[PDB]
């Protein structure tokens, strides 16, 4: 079916799957830092907690880290913990050494979330310029600002940035959202600051400016994932262009099989209102239609007054979108963008998803220790939940950004090695049952290795749940 | 190309066509009723002015009617004039006779744009019920409210409604937006109230509730077009379901070849802010990707403080979306949903668009007196402007809701009959030149009749602009 | 790609694939019965040997069976042995001199009087159809010899005999086949002679039957009864040589193990041009159904006497492969021809050419799209293995199959590489000779053990692929069998590197 | 739909379309030269008559031209008259008795000594190739008679003669064609004899040339020179009968008006199985290019002597249509056969069957998708007319064409209805006989006027469609010509109801 024919035949009043495939990121703040509120977030459907290191002492974030782990352990929940960097930020005389030998007479310097426009006339000396206020406004201390024109000469990883990432490694974060990534080598610089000790931590590059967009191929190649950081992006490039940026980045990550997060103002009005606007409901649903793994929440939960409800909405919208998607068409078009010949693992994951569609399997079970194979299954967009039986707790938590996945922990030190995969496969099936995805009689597709092969999955299996 | 492959290859930094295909509806109010402001709307890119008869005296709207015609004639602009009915509205004790024998103990009565929830417990007598306030609030006089559960026993066309439509016929409106259309026969009732004198006026049914959605096939069959009225819709059915409603209605109208308008809160935050939110930019762009002819503005221009700017944004977003669309894929999937055999006119319009793509024509020119053939060309979604040379001024104004069309008036009483079509064809070409769409050398596709045939187009032509 | 775009990009002077997927069925006869001639056909490309029980005694066919088995053993070949039944078939008797010549305008007497079986002349000769004079009325047609001889019926002479008018020149040979198309032929689906042939076939351990003139599912049912419990594992391939066969194709495929498009008779029973369409229907339907199909009769006709085929013959063969036939067949050409070996070599050369001219991934997908969801686990697994073959450009696909059920279900999805089938039944090796792409190797379980592991059969298969020159250490294979728990069907797919 | 899904839904006992789109080319010979026999072929289905200038004198062909013109006039038929050149062709001389018989093992002497032209024997005979002994060295092969006779060269005897070893039984007839595939043949692209033939053809007003052995665009260029200014409107159809022809197909199509897949020789010059692929390349490329293509040689071979074809012959013909050929051809079968009329009737019956088995909308779209954008206005218009045909299930498509350029460009897009071409040139009527779907009617402008309106030619076309039984009042047609202003090409499409 074409998109057109598909749309014409959508049911609207028949009920839907309740197994929500997409993942919701939440930013923690005053509204949501208490343990009790973190529990509400988890219950309401958060999978990842975002610490925004553009604000607050190491000590402030320590509280977040503590309260979360308290909430998550209490509820038995796996929750990605993410550290979002300050980056080469610019706040306010304004904080930017090379400001004058960097910005042209004629260009633009927007301030305070893009609201205040200013045009440059000439250079006064080595410090500042004299400019032209294009619309009136009032202007707090310490407000963020963009230089759409010039490419900024601040470092990808500042000194504060080293101290933050170091603190992050020490607290065992699961992933990094690196603000303002412009190139592949900047990604490499984040990788370095993390060092040997932080080498198993996911870097999600935030694309926030012109150059990030231009270098997307390279950044994707070097990162574990992308965030479409639309706040800054919408100020750095014309507002309407962001729509195209979002489509490009989401689809390229989809082809690359790397998680991608859509961010910023998705349900903005819910910062203060019980109900979202019509535009906002549609934004969330369309980020899912674009192929986004994750949709994110910022102000809405950091400092909003409806943090449970806003997440509940987000979850409800994702479910609806998910059910209005022709998922087999997604699977297929992704398959078609892959080079032949595939590696054996990739052909296996691709083919397992094929089987899922062929037998209408109710669950897909994959053994992954690093998450590689989980992400490789999810890359192919099956219409069912992916159970991942994993030996690492870090993997459970990192897999919270990947569409469709519920991770289950096999404690190998306690229960044995499981060379023949039987204990892990059993653990996965029980998980699928416990969660209501399957019952005896249903078909499952299972992915792992045969007896000989080590270091990747090379086998698919179709089994009947007992 | 798949959607996926398409998205991966979008340019973002190359420039685009500036011939905007989609149309922008504006609601007139305190911010926009003066002649000078109406001129700004026209300049900023309004094509249709919406009078909201849910508020204001006949005398208030008379001002609007006058100021508009003053602005439009001054600027030489063609502007659809639309009358949006009060309908079976409910404001506030609440205004609804059969309220108690109509609503169940257990159902819901939301009030004031969906904000205030109330659950029904039992029946007191023949007047009112006693209910349960689910969230606190403050509650002005005269606030609109919905009954999601029951199907309302108010008339499709009330008495006020007759007086309004009668006033509308007398003022020569171009089209009607009928609130709360639930069935085909309700459409028929609007048609009756309009009478013989109003028989050439377009009825655009507003879909705003459960039943409208269920009966869409029938309503489309009976109407000239649809509006996705998402304000009321988002309160009558679960918020997230509107996303699906929008997709169904837009595509069905697209298959039916009838104009469709997407409405309500598209750039809401711009009621007060100079910049739209990220969610709002995306809403507008996605309504264009859905296949909407028109996107609409309500509060944003009725009572907003940035009415020019908000329209300018809307126009800029439409252009971007339009340019990121695979328009040939749209053309094709529409063609494929039509029954064989087509009528000759339809095969002609379909085929002209085919030629447009084949020779990359820069303009498509069609002679239509009623608009039939204009709408029939636009149905097939060419990637160029459609010039329509028409003999009726009412047609120019009604064609303002149809994608891609610029209408040009041939004054037949003044200039002659033009049986061989030469004067009208010349008029159309000059129009395309005047507007910068073509220059000598370019190819145009032209649609009208051969010398013999009367009452529809049966001929296509490919010509070189001199 | 579309068919058009595909064609304009075909190469003609580039190398082609070396591994022939289609299979060749050879009819045995004077030219071909000796052990030596059999070795000849095997080396030349024969996968299947067809005994035509329309000629010869049981003893005659015993010679064929013995010689075939001796030649196959010398060469270490699996060769399917097929018994093609007489059916409800009307043949002529014998002619004085072993031949008679007929001229347009002439009359002749056609009789069912058995007295005249041996002594056919210009003036009277015998056809074996006792109810001739009741069945074919004046103004009817009797066709003879692949329908090349046209006779019109003038009158009934007596209880035995019709007077006929000769329409065209022909030289008539002993015991030709006749067609009465405008007619209800009063004849058993399975005659007494047929039951004996079949029973004989069962004792002699044939692999498959080619059942002539199959009209209905019920008749397939009859042949199945006739093989009995003892013969239950023998494949039945139904021959579609008439109107009703084509009409009832869906049911005949249901009941059957396979289909032969028997074009000789079919081209006389129905207008000649409609054979083209029936050929396309039967092949594609067998493909969709996953049952082997064979295209037969006159494919390389002129090589009965000539060391090279006509241009028409060559494209007939290629198009049969393009249509999607598993097998193409020979008749005249191997039974009594002058070039039994070269005609086979030509057929195999034409198959390979067409094979490599095919867009095989598109075949595969076509077939997939025509199957109901949900699939059985077996079918998803096989379908998906083949999917994996294309994704990794695998050099061979190995499937463990005892019945052959799983091998046929793999081959169903039309991979573009050899399929190895490790089988624990010798008979299955031989029955898989009519299935595109399959090479079978035998695993002697009695002599080597249960192999619940599957390792021994997997190794055997890999080694078979190596011996055949399909793979070397480093190459990817796709392997299909069951996990440790599941019995009765495959539920597992592995992609391995060849050690 | 996919090819598979299409097939499984083909019907075989449902009615078929009645309006034959493909065209039949008949070679004239003894069997067919009389006026009466010509009327015979015309009524039977011949659209084109091929003179083979490899046999017969100018006077002989004059008889053919005259008889054809007399028969076409009696019947009011447009028949394309084609001159098929000798080319750089090597034929044998004459044999005593008009035939000789050769046995495997034998030697024979093959000589280029003209003394031996008339007197060929078992022991020595003549082939017309003066440079024989230089060109074909020991251990080479000489093939004769559609490459059925195989001789190996042993030694050179003298300046004229080679000793050869006979590979197989054959009965050799006077003046057969020879192939030296392993060889540079020292022969003119256009001999002196050729220039005269062509010049003769030009005076006699032939419609088209079938140019033998065309190797390069330059050689097409040579034939064009040879026709001169006077012959500039004659169509050149290049025959691809060798390696270089296939190799240089893209350039030969550029230079040519069309292509014949001449399979007789081609099947000897290149491995027999590769003809299948060359056939698919040439046809599809001509389709993409919008130039007519003909498939030739041995299509219905056995009907030279038999009143019905073989199963192979029938599918050869159908598959040529499926491939997308405009025309299929006859040779032996009409020139010297016993059933000139029935062989044509069979061919037309097979064409129609295959035509109706085709998914014609899919042909059309394939071809569209293979064209560069932007198209010329002409091409968009024609492409879009055909588009309209499918959309309204039109009963006929009318196009005004004087050169035939626009008719060929309409037919290019493979509508599934008759195309009427109103033309002001009698020659165009006759040249359009090799273009699928076209029926031409003649508009006598000198006698009826300028018709800048187009009304007179539009009416003429509609009336032609009525006479032919394609349309009645009420039916939809699609009509293609120019608006009032544009000259030199069509830029306009109309859908009308037939009054
Ligand atoms: O952790 P990743 O890289 O996803 O790989 C996991 C895969 O490797 C294997 C084989 O080595 O792991 P395991 O050894 O835990 O059984 C597969 O069974 C499993 O699917
Ligand atoms: O006004 P609608 O119904 O679109 O029909 C207009 C069509 O009818 C015709 C023919 O009657 O109008 P007109 O008579 O003005 O020339 C066509 O030329 C024209 O395209
Ligand atoms: O014999 P068929 O029906 O083809 O099925 C064979 C399949 O069954 C299984 C399991 O029963 O056989 P086996 O037990 O011989 O190993 C699979 O391994 C094998 O692929
Ligand atoms: O002769 P060709 O090149 O086919 O083109 C003929 C076309 O040119 C035109 C216009 O020149 O011919 P005509 O002037 O004879 O009417 C079209 O009407 C006609 O369809
Ligand atoms: O960093 C962000 O999330 C942004 O600016 O959108
Ligand atoms: O009527 C409307 O426009 C609405 O409620 O959305
Ligand atoms: O028996 C056959 O094979 C036939 O009739 O073609
Ligand atoms: O000349 C021919 O037609 C041939 O060689 O096939
Ligand atoms: K940050
Ligand atoms: K209203
Ligand atoms: K038989
Ligand atoms: K010739
Ligand atoms: Mg940012
Ligand atoms: Mg409303
Ligand atoms: Mg038979
Ligand atoms: Mg030749």
Domains within chain A, CATH numbers bracketed: 1-19+322-453 (3.40.1380.20), 20-87+156-321 (3.20.20.60), 88-155 (no CATH)
What is the biggest distance separating any 2 CA atoms in chain D, rounded to whole angstroms? 78
Contact at 8 Å (CB) between A368 and A390?
A: yes
Q: Which of D20, D39, D50, D291 is catalytic?
A: D50
Residue of A338, A354, A458 lying closest to C495 (CB–CB):
A458
Backbone angles phi, psi at A332, to 5 degrees: -65, -40
What whole-number distance in Å separates Cα of residue D419 and Cα of residue D398?
6
* SS3 category, D193: helix
What whole-number distance in Å separates Cα of residue A6 and Cα of residue B254?
13
Chains C and D touch (3+ CB pairs under 8 A): yes
What Rg do the C-alpha atoms of chain C give, in angstroms? 24
What whole-number distance in Å separates Cα of residue B410 and Cα of residue C205?
90
Identify the H or E element spanning A225: strand A225-229
Q: Is C265 annotated as a binding residue?
A: yes
Closest alpha carbon to B219 in B255, B249, B247: B249
What whole-number distance in Å separates Cα of residue D198 and Cα of residue A21?
76
Q: Judging by DSSP bridges, how do beta strands A202-207 and A175-178 pair with one another? A: parallel
Beta-carbon contacts of A376 under 8 Å, excluding residues fewer than 6 positions away, are: A257, A345, A346, A349
What whole-number distance in Å separates Cα of residue C335 and Cα of residue C303?
12
Closest alpha carbon to B143 in B105, B116, B103, B122: B116
B107 conformational bin, left if phi > 0, alpha if psi -120 to 50, beta if neither: beta
What whole-number distance in Å separates Cα of residue C147 and Cα of residue C162?
18
* Chains touching B (3+ CB pairs < 8 Å): A, D
First-to-last CA distance in chain D?
36
Beta-carbon contacts of A95 under 8 Å, excluding residues fewer than 6 positions away, are: none
Backbone angles phi, psi at C87, to 5 degrees: 70, 180
DSSP per position, D145-156 = TTTTEEEEEEEE
Beta-carbon contacts of C40 under 8 Å, excluding residues fewer than 6 positions away, are: C32, C340, C341
Q: What is the DSSP letter of D370?
A: T
Q: Which of B27, B64, B264, B325 is catalytic?
A: B264
Q: Residue A222 to residues A202, A205, A218, A294: CA-CA distances in angstroms?
A: 11, 9, 6, 20
Q: Which of C69, C86, C91, C466 is catalytic?
A: C91
C311 included as an active-site residue? no
Identify the H or E element spanning C71: helix C58-75
CA distance B258 to chain A (A): 14
The verdict on a CB contact (< 8 Å) between D393 and B340 is yes
The verdict on a CB contact (< 8 Å) between C310 and D298 is yes
Beta-carbon contacts of A461 under 8 Å, excluding residues fewer than 6 positions away, are: A445, A446, A447, C483, C491, C492, C493
Q: Which residue, chain included where needed, has tokens 């599941």?
A: C486
Residue of A242, A252, A329 lying closest to B278 (CB–CB):
A242
Chain A contact present for C409, CB below 8 A:
no
What whole-number distance in Å separates Cα of residue A209 and Cα of residue D351?
64
Cα A395 versus chain centre, distance: 15
CB environment B18-45: b (16+ within 10 A), e (fewer):
ebbbbbbbbbbbebbbebebbbbbbebb
What Rg do the C-alpha atoms of chain D give, in angstroms? 24
* SS3 category, B25: strand
Probe residue for ligand 5, chosen from A27, A226, A235, A264 as the CB with the greatest number of ligand atoms within 8 Å: A264
Sign of CA dihedral D191, D193, D195, D197: negative
Neighbours of B113 (CB within 10 A): 16
Backbone angles phi, psi at D271, to 5 degrees: -50, 135
> Where do runs of H (alpha helix) occur along B257-326?
278-290, 299-302, 307-323
Pick the residue from chain B with its C-alpha nearest to A249: B8
What is the biggest distance separating any 2 CA atoms in chain B, rounded to whole angstroms? 79
What whole-number distance in Å separates Cα of residue D346 and Cα of residue B188?
62
Closest alpha carbon to C32 in C43, C22, C21: C43
* SS3 category, B255: helix
Chain B residues closer than 8 Å to A209 by CB: none
Residue of C274, C314, C346 lying closest to D276 (CB–CB):
C314
The verdict on a CB contact (< 8 Å) between A358 and C483 is no
Q: How many helices (H) and strands (E) does chain B have?
A: 18, 17
**Token pair for D473:** 């009042």
Beta-carbon contacts of A262 under 8 Å, excluding residues fewer than 6 positions away, are: A227, A228, A230, A246, A250, A287, A290, A292, A294, A295, A296
Q: Write the secondary structure of A78-97 as one string of H (helix), E (strand) and C (coil).
A: CCEEEEECCCCCCCCCCCCH
What whole-number distance in Å separates Cα of residue A4 and Cα of residue B254?
9
**Token pair for A146:** 């963009």
DSSP per position, D316-336 = HHHHHHHHT-SEEEESHHHHT
Backbone angles phi, psi at C200, to 5 degrees: -55, -50
**Testing the interface with D: which of B340, B358, B454 to mutate, by most D Cβ within 10 A?**
B358
Distance from the CA of C403 to the center of ligand 3, in angstroms? 8
What whole-number distance in Å separates Cα of residue D373 and Cα of residue D375?
5
What Rg do the C-alpha atoms of chain B give, in angstroms? 23
**Token pair for C306:** 């000539």
What whole-number distance in Å separates Cα of residue A343 and Cα of residue C388?
10
Q: What is the DSSP letter of D214?
A: -
Backbone angles phi, psi at A392, to 5 degrees: -120, 135
Beta-carbon contacts of B255 under 8 Å, excluding residues fewer than 6 positions away, are: A4, A8, B334, B337, B338
DSSP per position, D259-322 = EEEEHHHHHHHS-TTHHHHHHHHHHHHHHHHT--EEEESSTTGGGGT-SS--HHHHHHHHHHHH
What whole-number distance in Å separates Cα of residue C49 and Cα of residue C331?
10
Contact at 8 Å (CB) between C79 and C48?
A: yes
**Token pair for A299:** 């102000």
Closest alpha carbon to C116 in C144, C94, C145, C142: C94
Q: Please, which experimental method was used?
A: X-ray
Q: What is the DSSP letter of B19?
A: -
- Closest approach atom of ligand 3 to CA C424: 15
Strand blocks (E) in D312-403: 327-330, 396-400
D239 included as an active-site residue? yes
Q: Which residue, chain included where needed, has tokens 């399979």?
A: D263
Q: Which residue, chain included where needed, has tokens 């004054």?
A: B411
What whole-number distance in Å separates Cα of residue B155 and Cα of residue B351?
44
**Token pair for C346:** 């030509």
What whole-number distance in Å separates Cα of residue B216 and Cα of residue A156?
54
Q: Residue C244 to residues B37, C113, C295: CA-CA distances in angstroms?
A: 81, 29, 18
Chain A contact present for B246, CB below 8 A:
yes
Distance from the CA of C478 to the center of ligand 1, in angstroms? 19
DSSP per position, C101-117 = EE-TT-EEEEE--GGGS
Q: Is C145 annotated as a binding residue?
A: no
**Structure's resolution in angstroms:** 2.8
Residue of C12, C306, C315 lying closest to D316 (CB–CB):
C315
Pick the residue from chain A with its C-alpha nearest to C377: A462
**Token pair for B267:** 């750039």
Contact at 8 Å (CB) between D301 and C312?
A: yes
- Closest approach atom of ligand 1 to CA A449: 18
Sign of CA dihedral D456, D458, D459, D465: positive
What whole-number distance in Å separates Cα of residue D393 and Cα of residue D375?
25
Q: Judging by DSSP bridges, how do beta strands D80-84 and B386-390 pair with one another? A: unpaired
The verdict on a CB contact (< 8 Å) between A277 and B285 is no
Residue of B250, B279, B317 lying closest to A280 (CB–CB):
B279
The helix, strand and coil proportions of chain D, stated in percent and rounded to the nearest 5, come to 40, 20, 35
Identify the H or E element spanning A52: strand A48-52
Tell the burial category of C345 from Cβ atoms under 10 Å away from its Cβ (0-12, 13-18, 19+).
middle
Q: Which residue, chain included where needed, has tokens 């009558």?
A: B236
CB environment D101-130: b (16+ within 10 A), e (fewer):
ebeeeebbbbbbbeebbeebebebbbbebe
What whole-number distance in Å separates Cα of residue C414 and Cα of residue C21?
10
**Token pair for D106:** 């034998």
CA distance A126 to chain B (A): 32
Residue of C374, C476, C495 lying closest to A358 (CB–CB):
C374
Q: What is the DSSP letter of C280?
A: H
- The long-range contacts involving A189-192, CB below 8 angstroms and separated by at least 24 positions, are A189/A155, A189/A156, A189/A157, A190/A156, A190/A157, A190/A165, A191/A222, A192/A157
Q: How many helices (H) and strands (E) does chain C have?
A: 19, 22
Distance from the CA of C18 to the center of ligand 15, in angstroms? 33
Q: In what order do the strands lie in the sheet with D107-111?
A: D90-91, D177-179, D141-144, D149-158, D161-166, D107-111, D124-126
Specify the residue with its C-alpha closest to ligand 7, atom 2: C262
Chain C residues closer than 8 Å to A443 by CB: 374, 377
**Token pair for C273:** 């041009």
> Where do runs of H (alpha helix) occur along A261-343?
278-290, 299-302, 307-323, 327-335
Q: Which of D23, D239, D291, D430 is catalytic?
A: D239
Chain A contact present for B254, CB below 8 A:
yes
Residues with CB under 6 A from ligand 7: C 212, 239, 241, 262-265, 296-297
Closest alpha carbon to B81 in B160, B192, B180, B171: B171
**Testing the interface with A: which of C415, C476, C493 to mutate, by most A Cβ within 10 A?**
C493
B91 included as an active-site residue? yes
Q: Residue A171 to residues A29, A75, A175, C459: CA-CA distances in angstroms?
A: 18, 21, 11, 50
Nearest 5°: the CA angle B383, B386, B388 is 170
Q: Which residue, chain included where needed, has tokens 């045995």?
A: C28
Q: Does ligand 8 lie within 6 Å of residue D241's CB atom?
A: yes
What whole-number distance in Å separates Cα of residue D305 and Cα of residue C302?
14
Pick the residue from chain A with its C-alpha nearest to C489: A462
The verdict on a CB contact (< 8 Å) between A347 and C376 is no
DSSP per position, C329-352 = EESHHHHT-S-HHHHHHHHHHHHH
The verdict on a CB contact (< 8 Å) between A12 and B276 is no
Chain A contact present for B369, CB below 8 A:
no
| Beta-bridge partner residues of B17 | none
CA distance C421 to chain D (A): 27
Q: Residue D53 to residues C360, D86, D209, D483: CA-CA distances in angstroms?
A: 44, 5, 11, 45
CA distance C390 to chain A (A): 8
Using omega within 30 degrees of 0 as the cis cutoff, is the peptide bond preceding D199 cis?
no
What whole-number distance in Å separates Cα of residue B281 and Cα of residue B292?
15
Chain D contact present for C246, CB below 8 A:
yes
Sign of CA dihedral A435, A437, A443, A448: negative
Backbone angles phi, psi at D130, to 5 degrees: -50, -35
What whole-number distance in Å separates Cα of residue C321 and Cα of residue C360?
11
Sign of CA dihedral C84, C86, C88, C93: positive
- Closest approach atom of ligand 1 to CA A454: 11
Chain A contact present for B273, CB below 8 A:
yes
**Token pair for A360:** 């209408």
Using omega within 30 degrees of 0 as the cis cutoff, is the peptide bond preceding A341 cis?
yes
Q: What is the DSSP letter of D115?
A: G
Chain A contact present for B251, CB below 8 A:
yes
Distance from the CA of B239 to the center of ligand 14, in angstroms? 15
Pick the residue from chain B with its C-alpha nearest to D382: B355
Q: What is the DSSP letter of C369?
A: T
Crossing angle for the helix pair C360-368 and C377-392, to the nearest 10 degrees: 160
Contact at 8 Å (CB) between C110 and C151?
A: yes
**Token pair for B95:** 């205004």
* SS3 category, A296: strand
Beta-carbon contacts of D446 under 8 Å, excluding residues fewer than 6 positions away, are: none
Specify the residue with its C-alpha closest to ligand 6, atom 2: B229
**Token pair for D311:** 């199963």
CA distance A329 to chain C (A): 14
D297 included as an active-site residue? yes
């Amino acid at each position: 079916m074409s998109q057109l024919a598909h749309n014409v035949n959508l049911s609207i009043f028949e009920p839907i799957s309740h197994h929500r495939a997409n993942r919701i990121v939440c930013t923690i703040g005053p509204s949501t830092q208490s343990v009790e509120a973190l529990k509400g977030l988890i219950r309401s459907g958060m999978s990842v907690a975002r610490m925004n290191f553009s604000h607050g002492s190491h000590e402030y974030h320590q509280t977040t880290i503590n309260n979360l782990r308290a909430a998550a352990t209490e509820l038995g929940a796996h929750i990605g913990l993410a550290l979002d960097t300050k980056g080469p930020e610019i706040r306010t005389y304004i904080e930017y050494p090379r400001l004058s030998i960097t910005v042209r007479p004629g260009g633009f310097i927007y301030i305070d979330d893009g609201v205040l426009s200013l045009k440059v006339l000439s250079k006064e000396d080595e410090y500042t310029l004299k400019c032209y206020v294009n619309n009136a406004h009032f202007l707090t201390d310490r407000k963020g600002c963009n230089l759409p024109g010039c490419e900024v000469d601040l470092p990808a990883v500042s000194e504060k940035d080293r101290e933050d990432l170091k603190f992050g490694v020490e607290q065992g974060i699961d992933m990094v959202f690196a603000s303002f990534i412009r190139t592949a080598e900047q990604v490499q610089e984040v990788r370095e600051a993390l060092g040997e000790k932080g080498k198993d931590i996911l870097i999600i590059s935030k694309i926030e400016n012109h150059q990030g967009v231009q270098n997307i191929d390279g950044i994707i190649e070097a990162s574990d994932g992308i965030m479409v950081a639309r706040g800054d992006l919408g100020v750095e490039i014309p507002a309407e262009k962001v729509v195209v940026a979002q489509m490009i980045l989401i689809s390229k990550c989809n082809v690359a099989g790397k998680p991608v997060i859509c961010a910023t103002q998705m349900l903005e009005s819910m910062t203060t209102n019980p109900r979202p606007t019509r535009a906002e409901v549609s934004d969330v649903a369309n980020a899912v239609f674009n192929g986004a793994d994750c949709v994110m929440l910022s102000g809405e939960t950091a400092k909003g007054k409806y943090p449970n409800e806003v997440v509940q909405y987000m979850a409800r919208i994702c479910l609806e979108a998910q059910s209005a998607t022709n998922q087999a068409v997604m699977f297929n078009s992704i398959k078609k963008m892959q080079k032949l010949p595939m590696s054996p693992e990739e052909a296996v994951c691709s083919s397992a998803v094929n089987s899922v569609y062929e037998v209408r399997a109710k669950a897909l079970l994959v053994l992954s220790n690093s998450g590689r194979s989980a992400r490789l299954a999810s890359k192919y967009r099956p219409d069912c939940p992916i159970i991942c039986a994993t030996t690492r707790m870090r993997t459970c938590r990192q897999l919270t950004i990947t569409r469709s996945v519920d991770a289950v922990f096999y404690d190998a030190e306690r229960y044995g090695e499981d060379e023949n995969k039987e204990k892990r496969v059993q653990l996965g099936v029980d998980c699928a049952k416990k969660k209501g995805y399957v019952v005896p009689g249903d078909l499952m597709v299972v992915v792992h290795a045969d007896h000989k092969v080590k270091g990747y999955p090379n086998q698919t299996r179709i089994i009947y749940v007992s």
